[PDB]
Amino acid sequence: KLYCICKTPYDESKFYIGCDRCQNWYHGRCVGILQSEAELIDEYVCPQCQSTEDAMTVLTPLTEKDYEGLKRVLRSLQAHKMAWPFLEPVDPNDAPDYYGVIKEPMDLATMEERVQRRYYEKLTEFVADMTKIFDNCRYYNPSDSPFYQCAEVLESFFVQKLKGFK
Amino acid sequence: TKLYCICKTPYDESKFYIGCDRCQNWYHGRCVGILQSEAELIDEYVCPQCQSTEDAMTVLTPLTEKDYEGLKRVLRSLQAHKMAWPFLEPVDPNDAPDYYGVIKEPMDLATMEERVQRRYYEKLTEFVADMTKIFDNCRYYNPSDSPFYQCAEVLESFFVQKLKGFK
Amino acid sequence: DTKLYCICKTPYDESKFYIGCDRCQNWYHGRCVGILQSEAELIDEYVCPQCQSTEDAMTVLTPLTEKDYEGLKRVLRSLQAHKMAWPFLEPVDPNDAPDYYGVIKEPMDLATMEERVQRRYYEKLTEFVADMTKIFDNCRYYNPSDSPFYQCAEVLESFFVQKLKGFK
Amino acid sequence: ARTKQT
Ligand SMILES: [Zn+2]
Ligand SMILES: [Zn+2]
Ligand SMILES: [Zn+2]
Ligand SMILES: [Zn+2]
Ligand SMILES: [Zn+2]
Ligand SMILES: [Zn+2]
């Protein structure tokens, strides 16, 4: 039987630590955790399992707590200085050709209503709408336009704000 | 830069260690003969050296009230032994006229019981010394082929076993 | 009859008043056990001083009955509700007592005792008393003599001793 | 109680 990421036979002289998620054992050194540092913690999640958890954060059901975060994030975006061009839908008259090229329009007010209506069931759906705002802008406007730059700035801000969301 | 374990080596972050609660030193599981899964089942650990010291001091520490109850039981176990008949009471001068002239420090089980009763002993070594005197006097006074001599040999062997794990 | 009666160990004296112990069946001079003849008439079952002493010393060594257990819960609860009991209701929190477990090698508290009573862990009263005494002795060893914690232990133990009188 | 008299 093999253990750890290194897939090696058990060595009675080495320090091992067990993952509470998968129930497997790993060499403290292979997973990067001091023997003492482990004495403090009460639960352990190995690299493989942790990676799976990070990847599923966007797929799991959104909780009430998650929704408090969605409102918090959405509001920080709406208050951002570079967000003025995305607060409301594009008026058909302001740009008649807009709805001809942009197949999936989106804006912050629509997302606000969706959040209020509990329309989102997975974080991924919320991230998808936000990404749509930026992608539509970059598609419709030239790379040298302040509009295009506002999208660049806002998405960078957004990505950071999502770190450690849930 | 401190050295740990019986092997006196620097701490190796990748090795399994177990700490001694008595001396506070750390030991490699393998060096002290303890498996990592076996260590999860113990809350207190005493290393080989400390355990050796604890085993050696058992005869020097003060006798507790519980120890005394135990000593009375050891004596009773011996007094009931078939080979103890010649050591139950002090030798009778009328039975062996030269005994007290030959044996300078006589001892017997009844005298030891009296000593236990009055809390005369304060350390295990003192109790063991009186017992040993009983056997040494017998082996000196009687020839090695005498049943008396063999009774001392048998009873002493019994006694040594009885004292195992006393404290 | 060559038997030596009473505590004074003497032969039967037909001219003296004796009372018989129903426990050991020995006979005692009324005077030697403090019993007056006129008084004996009002006594039904009689137990001599020595048998009574043995029965009293015996209380902590006999098996605990279900009724005894009801008493143990009652005693425990009277202690948990006592004003000076607050420091002993649950196991000590390391964060509240510096190196507590480095000083006290046999911790004990009322919650742990309550659980022990619940699973009928005690077989003799002496074991219950030992755990309780452990709580007070631990406190008195860890805390200074002028500490209110130390005083709480003094008060509760005094309270406990009285509460146990006439238990069995 | 059981007793023995004079
Ligand atoms: Zn895992
Ligand atoms: Zn490994
Ligand atoms: Zn070693
Ligand atoms: Zn040690
Ligand atoms: Zn009686
Ligand atoms: Zn009398």
Residues 6 or more apart whose Cβ sits within 8 Å of residue C159: C79, C82, C84
- Which segments of chain A belong to CATH 3.30.40.10? 1-55
Decide: helix, strand or coil at residue B166: coil
- Which segments of chain B belong to CATH 3.30.40.10? 1-56
CA distance B46 to C161: 38
> CATH homologous superfamily for A1-55?
Zinc/RING finger domain, C3HC4 (zinc finger) (3.30.40.10)
Measured in Å, residue B118 CA sits from the centre of ligand 6 at 29
Q: CB C40 to CB D4 under 8 A?
A: no
Residues 6 or more apart whose Cβ sits within 8 Å of residue B159: B74, B78, B131
| Structural method | X-ray
Does residue C89 contact residue C23 with C-beta atoms inside 8 Å?
Answer: no
Q: C36-63 b/e with 16+ CB inside 10 Å = b? A: eeeebeeeeebebeebeeeeeeeebeee
> CATH homologous superfamily for C59-168?
Bromodomain-like (1.20.920.10)
Fold of B1-56: Herpes Virus-1 (3.30.40)
CA distance A143 to B43: 67
The count of C-alpha atoms lying within 13 angstroms of the C-alpha of B103, restricted to the half-sphere facing its C-beta, is: 23
- CB atoms closer than 10 angstroms to residue B162: 16
How many whole angstroms from its chain centre is CA C98?
34
- Which segments of chain C belong to CATH 1.20.920.10? 59-168
Q: CB C22 to CB D3 under 8 A?
A: no
CA distance C108 to C106: 7
Does residue A87 contact residue A108 with C-beta atoms inside 8 Å?
Answer: yes
- CB atoms closer than 10 angstroms to residue C88: 25
Q: CB C20 to CB D1 under 8 A?
A: yes
What are C136's two structure tokens? 């007070």
CA distance C49 to C31: 12
Q: Which amino acid is at B60?
A: L
Q: Three-state SS across A78-92? A: HCCHHHHHHCCCCCC
CATH 3.30.56.10 is held by the domain C1-57: no
What are C137's two structure tokens? 């002795």
Domain B58-167, CATH number (from 3.90.420.10, 1.10.10.10, 1.20.920.10, 2.40.50.1020): 1.20.920.10
**For tokens 């009277």, what's the residue?**
C78
* β pairing state of B26-28 and B17-19: antiparallel
Q: Which chains would you list as touching D if contact means 3+ CB atom pairs under 8 Å? A: C
**In sequence order, what are the beta bridge partners of C5?**
C10
Decide: helix, strand or coil at residue B149: helix
Q: CB D5 to CB C37 under 8 A?
A: yes
C19 touches D: beta carbon within 8 Å: yes
Does residue C122 contact residue C72 with C-beta atoms inside 8 Å?
Answer: yes
Q: B24 CA to chain A: closest CA distance, Å?
A: 15
Q: B121-153 b/e with 16+ CB inside 10 Å = b? A: beebeebbebbebbbebbbebbeeeeeebebbe
- Asked whether at least 3 C-beta pairs link A and B within 8 Å, the reply is yes
CATH class of the A57-166 domain in this structure:
mainly alpha
- Which segments of chain B belong to CATH 1.20.920.10? 58-167
C19: nearest CA in chain D? Answer: D3
- Which segments of chain C belong to CATH 3.30.40.10? 1-57
CA distance A87 to A77: 9
N residues, chain D: 6
Decide: helix, strand or coil at residue A2: strand
CA distance C80 to C71: 14
CA distance A111 to B150: 102
Does residue B81 contact residue B155 with C-beta atoms inside 8 Å?
Answer: yes
- Element containing residue A137 per DSSP (H, E): helix A123-140
Does residue C101 contact residue C168 with C-beta atoms inside 8 Å?
Answer: no
